Design a protein around this ligand. Sequence first.
Ligand SMILES: Nc1ncnc2c1ncn2[C@@H]1O[C@H](COP(=O)(O)OP(=O)(O)OP(=O)(O)O)[C@@H](O)[C@H]1O
Ligand SMILES: Nc1ncnc2c1ncn2[C@@H]1O[C@H](COP(=O)(O)OP(=O)(O)OP(=O)(O)O)[C@@H](O)[C@H]1O
Ligand SMILES: [Mg+2]
Ligand SMILES: [Mg+2]
Lengths: 50, 391, 413, 889, 239
Amino acid sequence: RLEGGSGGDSEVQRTMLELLNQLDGFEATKNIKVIMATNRIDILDSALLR
Amino acid sequence: PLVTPHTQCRLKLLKLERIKDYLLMEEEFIRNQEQMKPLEEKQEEERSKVDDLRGTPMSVGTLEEIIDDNHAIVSTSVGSEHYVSILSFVDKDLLEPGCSVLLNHKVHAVIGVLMDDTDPLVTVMKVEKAPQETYADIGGLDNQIQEIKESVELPLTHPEYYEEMGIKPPKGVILYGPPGTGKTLLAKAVANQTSATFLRVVGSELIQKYLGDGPKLVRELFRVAEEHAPSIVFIDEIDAIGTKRYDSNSGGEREIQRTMLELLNQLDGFDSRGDVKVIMATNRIETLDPALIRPGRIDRKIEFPLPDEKTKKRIFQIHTSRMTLADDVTLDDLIMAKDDLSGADIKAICTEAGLMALRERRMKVTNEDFKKSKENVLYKKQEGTPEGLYL
Amino acid sequence: PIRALDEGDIALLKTYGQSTYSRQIKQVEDDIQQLLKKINELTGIKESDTGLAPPALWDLAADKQTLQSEQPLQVARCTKIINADSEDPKYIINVKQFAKFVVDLSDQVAPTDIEEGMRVGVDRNKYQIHIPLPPKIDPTVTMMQVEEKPDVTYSDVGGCKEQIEKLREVVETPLLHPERFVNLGIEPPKGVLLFGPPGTGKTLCARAVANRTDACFIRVIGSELVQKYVGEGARMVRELFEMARTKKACLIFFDEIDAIGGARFDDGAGGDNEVQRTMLELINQLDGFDPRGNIKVLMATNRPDTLDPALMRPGRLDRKIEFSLPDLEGRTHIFKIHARSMSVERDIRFELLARLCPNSTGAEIRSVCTEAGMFAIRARRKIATEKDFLEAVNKVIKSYAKFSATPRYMTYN
Amino acid sequence: MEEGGRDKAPVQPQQSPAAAPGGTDEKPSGKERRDAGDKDKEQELSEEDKQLQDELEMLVERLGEKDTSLYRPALEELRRQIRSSTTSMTSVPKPLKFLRPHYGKLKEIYENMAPGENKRFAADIISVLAMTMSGERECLKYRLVGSQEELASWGHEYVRHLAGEVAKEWQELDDAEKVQREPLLTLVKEIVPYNMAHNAEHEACDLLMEIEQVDMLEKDIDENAYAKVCLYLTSCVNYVPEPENSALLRCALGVFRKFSRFPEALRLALMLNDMELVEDIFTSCKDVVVQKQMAFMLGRHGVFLELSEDVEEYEDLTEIMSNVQLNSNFLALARELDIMEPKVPDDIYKTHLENNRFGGSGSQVDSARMNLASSFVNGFVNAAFGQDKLLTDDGNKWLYKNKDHGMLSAAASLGMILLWDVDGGLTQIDKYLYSSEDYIKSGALLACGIVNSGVRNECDPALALLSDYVLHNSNTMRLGSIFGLGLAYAGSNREDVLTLLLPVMGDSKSSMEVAGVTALACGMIAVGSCNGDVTSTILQTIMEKSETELKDTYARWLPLGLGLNHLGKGEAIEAILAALEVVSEPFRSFANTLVDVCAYAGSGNVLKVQQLLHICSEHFDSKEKEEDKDKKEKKDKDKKEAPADMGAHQGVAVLGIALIAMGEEIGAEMALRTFGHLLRYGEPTLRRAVPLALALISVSNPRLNILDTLSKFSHDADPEVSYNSIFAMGMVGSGTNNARLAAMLRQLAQYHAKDPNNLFMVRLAQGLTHLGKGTLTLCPYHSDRQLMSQVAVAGLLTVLVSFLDVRNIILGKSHYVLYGLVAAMQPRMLVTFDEELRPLPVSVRVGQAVDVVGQAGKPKTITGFQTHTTPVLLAHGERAELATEEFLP
Amino acid sequence: SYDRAITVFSPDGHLFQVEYAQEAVKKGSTAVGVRGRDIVVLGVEKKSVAKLQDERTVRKICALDDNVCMAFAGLTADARIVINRARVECQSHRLTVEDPVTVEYITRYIASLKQRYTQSNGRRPFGISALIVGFDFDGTPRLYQTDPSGTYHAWKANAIGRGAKSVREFLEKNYTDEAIETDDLTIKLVIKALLEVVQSGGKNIELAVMRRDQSLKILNPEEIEKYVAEIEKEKEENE
Ligand SMILES: Nc1ncnc2c1ncn2[C@@H]1O[C@H](COP(=O)(O)OP(=O)(O)OP(=O)(O)O)[C@@H](O)[C@H]1O
Ligand SMILES: Nc1ncnc2c1ncn2[C@@H]1O[C@H](COP(=O)(O)OP(=O)(O)OP(=O)(O)O)[C@@H](O)[C@H]1O
Ligand SMILES: [Mg+2]
Ligand SMILES: [Mg+2]
């Protein structure tokens, strides 16, 4: 999540917040498991790394 | 919600069988209700010909104007407008230009009027189930539990205190702080113990692409909440709905920015609000639009800081409720030695230590599980910040 | 060297520890949740009954007259007429969605009242004119004519003794004394913008003049101007600036005109194109040929920097009333407004409270007045003390405005 | 998958028991010593409960199951030691050797011979060895034996002491929450002979502990909240001697064996009343044991404390009878003039002030029946010493103006003005008595029974109202004289004035409403004996009701005193008594459902609740027995108000959906009186569900049915914010919902919520859950409202002064002997703690903090601190004694 | 927004770069100090030796002159310049004026040297705060303190560092108006005050006292362990 202005991107974050919430929103899902695989560990956001 | 032994005791075997007794009897009584009905008259001839008077493929129309000589004007979906009559049994008292009606095909005549007319995107956001446990579930946040109760529960249960001073209760509440602290729990516990209805909004939910479809769904959102109960609306992750309202060079940026500017209007703009409460939550607060932070819109700002060495004990106590705990452990070993970690960290420690017992063929959980678990969970946050300059 | 699963060792787990009540308590919870379902589909009592009248009045109609109003009654449509020709009908009629026909008049018409541009009832088979119609009125401006008084008196807009004085000149005074402007030889301005910090009192001045207007007042919802179809929003502008000319001296209040157009650019070849067509149509019915006469326009915004210089020109928006923060005499009057109708101690002073709110708005002052009574419900009281307000100032302002300057304060005493 | 290389135990205990048939015969040492080497090592690999996976116990039986089938039976020459090595080693894996039909064969290894002292190799292990397996024996094997053959073989004989030492072992090893596993063991074993199990477990608990009694003690009463008829009959009398024999907490006798008074034997609690008179040491626990014995659950105890110690130890009796009653009057005299209340508020009527500008003008309402409700601006607010000289001038004019039934009503309101009074209550009546009218004296002298109600001292057992009764040749002198004295002596079960007022039933003077309230007057007195009352009522019932097929003045009043004379016992002999006594036509068999379920006040007897539905469910019933399905639903209202909220959520779930949804005459006429009977606390679930069917008046019916549901929608006491509903419905209720019929009613509903500020306990739950009837005084009113025509003439006897058992309110007073202490009490939302970590935090709402006479509220177990020890009974009960001790520095 | 300069003001009149220097003080180890009847005392916490270094070069308590002490916070680099400069001034004062240096005179030098060091651009201010304790000015015990803004100020009991708000609130309910005589009682007050350390290991306290006539007396971890024992002796009265 970068700043506002004409920098960063909003729409990349707009999609990311839905990934941040369909597995951790008001309704907790069951029997659905996710696997994420990438390098560059320190530059993905500290809200889905929790 | 009274399963209060919380363990394999015969009481919970006795209590749930009582619940089995009443629901089976409620089944069998309504089973006898549709059984022993010897009443048949089927309309007393009135509605039965009426159900044959109207066409069987009932269609949907839209009023434009009202020519009240029992011969009005309507509009179809394409805009084909027809000088139709009013085939009867409709009171001309709840039909307004904009209210959708029911039509025929052979003569297109007005038979009924369509009610409630909700677009099926807002009815998805209507919660029917109380998901989790009550305020006794979370592990001690009582200074800020008493804050949100002053604005949601207490004005609805007992509004006799406020008339003695003429003070309206606060409306808007922001939940903000570091992630993993308890923001989503505090909404679910309110939605559990309540009496009014409940609406959830997941962030980028009111965002579409048809340039007017964005702000139009926001009007219908507060319309449904106003027409129903004196209820509350929970809109979560409002960091994707506001950032300081700057003007720039992208054209899709504006239909983003315009929808988020009329939410400002519906909230605390023109004359009235009704009994609608709004609860909002982010992780970051400084990157928001200052037009939303002002009072009149939001009257409570609530910090959720990372825990202490005292209420953290309550976190470990609750998440180790129904697990076989060996007597060798001390809860204050991991609490006092390390002083940095969230409440969502503690749930991961309790699940990982339980996996370590099956990993080495055990049921009970000792200190050596928590020694390996407190390592394995915490190695996802970087090494440090600066060297010994300060002293 | 760590592996601890084999199918025989699975059968160790689910027999050790409460083998008596494990499934005995579980399937009771399982089939009752099945029974939560099986009650619901056994009820099935949804009952969306609508359309029907009370079944004690329509009995006369649905005996024979409803059957008498199926086959003789007509499903005729309404249209518009372009023109006519002499000695004959030769009527040229459009639909704007269907085709354009050239048809005949029927027998039940008088051939005089078939004037041009008239809505007329048209047959479905041979498309003959049967019934002429009254003209169409616009359906959504009727929705936004307010017809309702919001109850705010000018005695609640304290701290603004001069901003109301500027706003009294434009709106109220030509509508009640249209003499001294002519009898000296001046003309009143016709457009006033309101700009400043949020929560300062923009909506209050608009809400209070809707009380004391004695005139036509139109609230305009801003995002109704933005539509899905091309050119539809520009047509909504026109119907607003036609009916205002019909009656005399109607007031039009826009609000947050930042949304309906702030800047005209094109570098990436596209973007907010349809918004500009509605916004430029607003301009040409504001100034241009055919000046409007007695139509007064009020606008209000929070971000006045990002607006188009085509709207910044006087002749469209003439008076720039701005709202600032009340110095001290304003705020001491504001506390006496928002705390007169509450149970307080009858000996407290308010000037000490107006000190401790240096850079504050009228919304923030009212939040202190509401919060101080909330401390009285934290304790068990029914009147407010002095320390109730003093803790409320620290709760509202000092909990968010400063955290380094209060403990480490020793640079200033 | 790192198998192999270290599989010692899947090889050598795979081979040596496989070589056990190879070494049973022709190897006398290898049969024995390899068995003992197998036995101790398999015993050792199970005692740590930190390796559930045992390297033998699910490794050997893959061949060892077929081995043991050929080793234990087929040996056939089993020695005295080799059976103690086989069965000790092979009865261990048999819950996991065998699948779910193990339940018939936990014996084909074990009960060949149980080797010695099986806990000798099962002591330190909790349940993995045999203690879960022991519960598997007592679940299925003992129950099929002890279904009809309790007195039987080794499956009972050794199994008794086997279950004895196992039940000792639950409180031996760790003393964890497996204390409660002992009632899990004692009740599954011999369900109906629980006492035969419990008698050994009583004496074992007496020598078990004196600190680990109390959580098992509350475990019993939580299991005693609902059971079968016989289980609630058994485990409640097992509950009695544990604070009598093991400990001497013993101040939980009087009310918590009023638990056990009506089920087991009425004399048994009287023997426990004798056990009260045994443990007379010293005064403080004795004081509060007998505080409840007068006006908290029953009276009638003033005959057993005038024995040989009449100085101070037996002179508490009259102090209990009327002096602490008058000290409770000193609450409403001293303390409640201090907190809120001057003599006349009189302004809930004045709270209807803003209505006169709501829609133009006012002063349009001139209905004469509103003046009935005008008496309750004076009537309801003046309870607990609202004494009024010349503030009754609104009464004094309207008494001498019109409205003969309101002349009786305004005279009956004077008894509510001076309630719980004996000192000068008759002197207030006498100046307003001598008007020489029928209606004035019959309302005033009925109100004289209301003044001395709950006193039961010498005021007028036959002095005033018996002389009022023998004046009869006429109207309500005949009626209103028998009602007040039976109201005053409702707490007593005296036989004499019952036989004075039995020739009221035996007169056969055919005033029908007099004989109907005669059943109600005698019904309030007795709940037990005197079967001649049942004889006297049914004689005139067979004389009168057989020669008619008409109104419920027969039906709402005459079988009700029968049910009040047989209230509260689930023996189902009283149904065999009453229903076979009035075997008759179905309009007299309306009374079948009355005495059936009036004996069924509260328990879990769900088998009755299905016959409370399935016989007369709907049938659509074209206007013949529609009263009976209402009264069958009337008896669904009780047996729901005390399982303590377990069935209350189920009651509001069923009766919200089933009747008011898919009903007819059952739902849309009568089925809202559940909510007027279930609770009087108020909560917005049902408080908002009733205006779903009230704002929709559904005016097509005789709408006073739905407006009866308006009336006792405000049958919730403890004043609230509910004024928003009633005043706004009173605004639409002036013009519409016409004021000719219910202008009395809406303001009856308006003025009843704020009855006084205080004294709202009318809800039949004392201490924690016991009844304290109570029921005999309320239940006539909800039986009375069926349906119409008693809003004008006959129900005005009832609707004012039906329920008059309000016991006081608040648990604030201290009574340490001089009555000077206040407290530091700490009020909270009630307990949830059932079994959690020791010690358990009792409540959760720490915010409220008072010292003295503050309120009760809906769920409040108010505790105290500052080391005053609060030692009295440790439950509560609003006359705590509060000694003083601080030996903890 | 606008800070990035020590010469500019805020629109509400602030110097944020001066205020940010006080934020660097809160990263330091806490050090407390009280004055008494005759014996002044100051103690520091958070030693935290790292198994492989000599501990005589990490010292936080130094003496400027023969009868004045020093305890500081902040960062170690900027303290070394202020200490080495103040040793010159408290020695050059004695040369120009033959008296010994009062405890009040040396604190005005440190504050005024930090004063002019804040005014000119391109001069990063000192991010340290100091405690000056000395019973030097004619038998009178005194203790002052400093601030990165350059304001010398006098307290009677002081706490700084990471966690000063708890200790300063602790001493207000603990510093009796009864003067703590029998000076081991006054030393036990500091050990009770330093008992609320960030971890309270017990062996991480370096108390240094001064009996107003002798030189500095650095306490050993055997005498300080005896005072930690009697603090647990008074704690036995809770049961
Ligand atoms: N105070 C607490 N007591 C008990 N459990 C907690 C507490 N705080 C967090 N948890 C745990 O954290 C989880 C809830 O996450 P939380 O509500 O913190 O999400 P969030 O604050 O919305 O996070 P984000 O802001 O990243 O979306 C629950 O599973 C719960 O077990
Ligand atoms: N000068 C004032 N005197 C009294 N009350 C005030 C004043 N200014 C603001 N308030 C109070 O603050 C509340 C919010 O003000 P309002 O929303 O009208 O400000 P605004 O400038 O219209 O906000 P925005 O710029 O976001 O539209 C009002 O309800 C009013 O009670
Ligand atoms: Mg969240
Ligand atoms: Mg505004």
